[PDB]
């Protein structure tokens, strides 16, 4: 039910006690007027709401995923 | 034969009065320490229509001499009273439209409304749209005071008996024709079930002293004795004269 943009805040969520699972979605999407680009939504299933953080920059996306806690049960796709 | 209409009204089945919408009973303040030694101020907080009444009520609120709180009385608005006006109730109150004073405390010719028959009965005389009573004199020793009610009747009451200065609001209401059956229809819809009215002369004998015959006609004098009995008293009960009132009325 929540969207999130502070990439710092996000991280802190995923290390909260109640957070057992997560999921990464990937969408094809097109930019501005012309070409496409790879959108990636990071979803953290909290106890009472699903936080989802969108990273348009596919770059930011990769070296985000390797930040993800080694203990979190991530759902890929 | 059958029980006639006017005896049926008394069991109040479909004849009780339609009441759902009414504001509350109109009443003076209880005749307490304040009101009988001095006076007490209130404010009309609203003057408002009461279903099936002809005259608007005024909600007037007061402080409670004995507790921290408000107490709201429901008055009948005298013509000219208004929201925000201050209302004074008491023996030692001043003579203004809206205040409530003991008929002993007011000069002859005073014009008041909602007056009590016995002190404290919280008001009984002249309440209807337009009516009032007039003080036509006092008699200090045994403190009685004498008024003329709207009927024309002169009557005397305790000088302690309270009344409210001025006349009741909404006057003239009856100079305007009802014009159609529907406006009487709605009129009684908010009073009681007394409309419309079948002439007994249009009924059969089972139904009414007047009923039956091969032409419609009352068949005997329609002036019935006081000492008549239920099912008998229809028409002009106890009528001491009858016929069109030629000549000026007005009590002598």
């Amino acid at each position: 039910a929540r969207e999130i943009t502070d990439i710092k805040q996000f991280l802190e969520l995923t290390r909260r006690a109640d957070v057992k699972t997560a999921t990464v979605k990937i969408n094809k999407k097109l930019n501005k007027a012309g070409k496409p680009f790879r959108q990636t939504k990071f979803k953290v299933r909290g106890s009472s709401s699903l936080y989802t953080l969108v990273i348009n920059d596919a770059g930011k996306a990769k070296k985000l995923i390797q930040s993800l806690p080694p203990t979190l049960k991530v759902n890929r796709l | 034969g059958r029980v006639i209409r006017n005896q049926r009204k008394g069991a109040g089945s479909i004849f009780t009065s339609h009441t759902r919408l009414r504001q509350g009973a109109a009443k003076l303040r209880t005749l307490d320490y304040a009101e009988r030694h001095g006076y007490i101020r209130g404010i009309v907080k609203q003057i408002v229509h009461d279903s099936g009444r002809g005259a608007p009520l005024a909600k007037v609120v007061f402080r409670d001499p004995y507790k921290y709180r408000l107490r709201e009385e429901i008055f009948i608005a005298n013509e000219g009273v208004h929201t925000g006006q201050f209302i004074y109730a008491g023996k030692k109150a001043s003579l203004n439209v809206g205040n409530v004073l003991p008929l002993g405390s007011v000069p002859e010719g005073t014009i008041v409304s909602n007056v009590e028959e016995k002190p404290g009965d919280r008001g009984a005389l002249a309440r209807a749209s337009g009516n009032y009573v007039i003080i036509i004199g006092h008699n200090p020793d045994e403190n009685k005071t004498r008024v003329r009610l709207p009927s024309g009747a002169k009557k005397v009451i305790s000088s302690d008996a309270r009344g409210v200065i001025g006349v009741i609001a909404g006057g003239g209401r009856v100079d305007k024709p009802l014009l159609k059956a529907g406006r009487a229809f709605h009129k009684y819809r908010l009073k009681r079930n007394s409309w419309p009215k079948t002439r007994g002369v249009a009924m059969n004998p089972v139904d009414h002293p007047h009923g039956g015959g091969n032409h419609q006609h009352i068949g005997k004098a329609s002036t019935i004795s006081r000492g008549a009995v239920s099912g008998q008293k229809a028409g002009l009960i106890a009528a001491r004269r009858t016929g069109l009132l030629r000549g000026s009325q007005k009590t002598q």
Binding site: - | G80, H82, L95, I111, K180
Partner: protein, 91 residues
């Protein structure tokens, strides 16, 4: 463009009820719908609503009055008379 010769607001009733009753209604009708002067705020913005209740558009004071007109002849003389009677009692 004058619309009606004499029935005025009373034209809603058509031919019904007979002239003389319509006459009598037209009067109080005109009385009762009209806009009146406000004693308190000065603007002429008192209109009726339910008999004997008169309220101000802006400023919002409500007065009890006649069923079809703000002040009633009787009420007014009664105002004059109490006035006079009060005068005696502190003079």
């Amino acid at each position: 463009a004058k619309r009606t010769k004499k029935v005025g607001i009373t034209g809603k009733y058509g031919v019904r009820y007979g002239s003389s009753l319509r006459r009598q209604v037209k009067k109080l009708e005109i009385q009762q719908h009209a806009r009146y002067d406000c004693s308190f705020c000065g603007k002429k913005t008192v209109k009726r609503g339910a008999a004997g209740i008169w309220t101000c558009s802006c400023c919002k004071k409500t007065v009890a009055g006649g069923a079809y007109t703000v002040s009633t002849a009787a009420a007014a003389t009664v105002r004059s008379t109490i006035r006079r009677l009060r005068e005696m009692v502190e003079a």
